[PDB]
Amino acid sequence: VCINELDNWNAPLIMATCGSKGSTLNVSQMVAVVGQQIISGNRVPDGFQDRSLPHFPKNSKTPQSKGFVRNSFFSGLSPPEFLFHAISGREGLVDTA
């Protein structure tokens, strides 16, 4: 529903409609929402005992606590969203080196 409300004669929608670089996933991840940063197939594990970050309660399997960002790159990430994106980025960054 972001690609349909997106006006024509812009750069990334043309670059996704034509070839070289950019898809609908990249423009939906810039504009609308980034979603579900996964590592090693599943979601992020418990970095501490019974939880991932110390900013969430114990036995909290909510999406905002266990690796689901909800802000797009235009709006800005929260620090748990920033750490969750940094883990999934450094996973793919170390598999190249």
Partner 1 sequence: VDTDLKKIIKANQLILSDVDPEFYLKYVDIRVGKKSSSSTKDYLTPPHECRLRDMTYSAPIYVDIEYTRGRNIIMHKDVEIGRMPIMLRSNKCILYDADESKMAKLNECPLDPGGYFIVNGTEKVILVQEQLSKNRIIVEADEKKGIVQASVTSSTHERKSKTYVITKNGKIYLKHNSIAEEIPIAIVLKACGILSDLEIMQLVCGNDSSYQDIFAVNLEESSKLDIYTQQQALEYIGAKVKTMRRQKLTILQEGIEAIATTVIAHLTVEALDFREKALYIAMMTRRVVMAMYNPKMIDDRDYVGNKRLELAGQLISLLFEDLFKKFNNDFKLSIDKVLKKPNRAMEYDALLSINVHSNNITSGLNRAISTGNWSLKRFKMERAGVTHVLSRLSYISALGMMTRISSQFEKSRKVSGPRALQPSQFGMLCTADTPEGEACGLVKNLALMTHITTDDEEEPIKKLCYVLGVEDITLIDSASLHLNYGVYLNGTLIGSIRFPTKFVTQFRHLRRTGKVSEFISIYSNSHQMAVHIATDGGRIC
Distance, in Å, from the CA atom of 18 to the CA atom of 20, rounded to the nearest integer, reads 7
| H or E element at residue 27 | helix 24-30
CA distances from 2 to 7, 23, 44, 63 (A): 10, 13, 27, 22
Which lies closer to partner 1 via its Cβ, residue 3 or residue 93? 93
Which lies closer to partner 1 via its Cβ, residue 25 or residue 93? 93
Binding site for partner 1 (CB under 8 A): 39, 44, 47-49, 52-54, 82-83, 86-87, 90-91, 93-94, 97
Which lies closer to partner 1 via its Cβ, residue 19 or residue 79? 79
> How far apart are CB 50 and partner 1 at their closest, in Å?
9
